[PDB]
């Protein structure tokens, strides 16, 4: 057995989003699909914001993080604070990702749909393509579900915005339950929100009962 995988600790949040900025950020179809291609500082210390409720992991091999996943808990409040938060940013790149995701979070509203107080919400799975043959997406979704468990949530939920990470999931069992084509997205003056490159087309959501 050739990876470690562990909690991440807040005194690694920077090596985790150094790892996040090399293989989650560039080719995440919502980064891809709105200027600049930087993420935001806000839209980096969200994902970081979730370090202390002990819901991130990393694998690790030979000192090195090789793949990240960034989840943390929501509540039947999500809906409205996704809509505050993309009304606060709009008009900036995370203000745009963020209508979308406010989109996706009120028409899933999950936390009602499947009648539970409390699911938890994966926000970022980023693996390295160099290192082969290790499993580290199942292994790290397996490892959120787990500390589902041990917290007591009953769901766990996640917006895959691209095909690599839907059929990780189906093959973990989740179920799909919502989609939205980047197409049909659009703001207030009838723009596009996503633009990403081909061959994105939509966002799904999947959704696994603990």
């Given at each position: 057995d050739d990876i470690v995988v562990r909690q991440v600790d807040v005194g690694e949040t920077e090596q985790l989003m150094t790892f996040l900025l090399a293989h989650?950020?560039?080719?995440e179809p919502l980064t891809a699909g709105t200027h600049p291609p930087e993420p935001e500082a806000a839209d980096k210390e969200f994902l970081l914001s979730n370090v202390p409720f002990g819901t991130c992991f990393v694998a690790l091999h030979e000192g090195r993080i090789v793949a990240a996943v960034v989840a943390g808990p929501k509540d039947s409040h999500e809906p409205e604070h996704m809509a505050e938060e993309a009304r606060k940013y709009a008009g900036g790149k995370w203000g745009s990702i963020l209508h979308l995701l406010s989109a996706v979070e009120t028409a899933t509203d999950v936390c009602r749909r499947f009648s539970v107080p409390s699911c938890l919400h994966v926000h970022a799975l980023g693996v390295d393509?160099?290192?082969?043959?290790?499993?580290l997406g199942g292994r790290l979704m397996e490892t959120v579900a787990q500390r589902g468990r041990d917290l007591g949530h009953q769901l766990v939920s996640v917006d895959c915005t691209s095909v690599y990470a839907a059929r990780l999931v189906q093959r973990l069992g989740y179920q799909l339950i919502n989609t939205l084509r980047y197409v049909d997205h659009l703001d207030a003056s009838g723009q596009q929100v996503i633009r990403p490159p081909p061959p994105h087309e939509s966002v799904q959501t999947f959704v696994l009962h603990l």
């Open positions: 989650y950020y560039p080719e393509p160099q290192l082969r043959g290790r499993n």
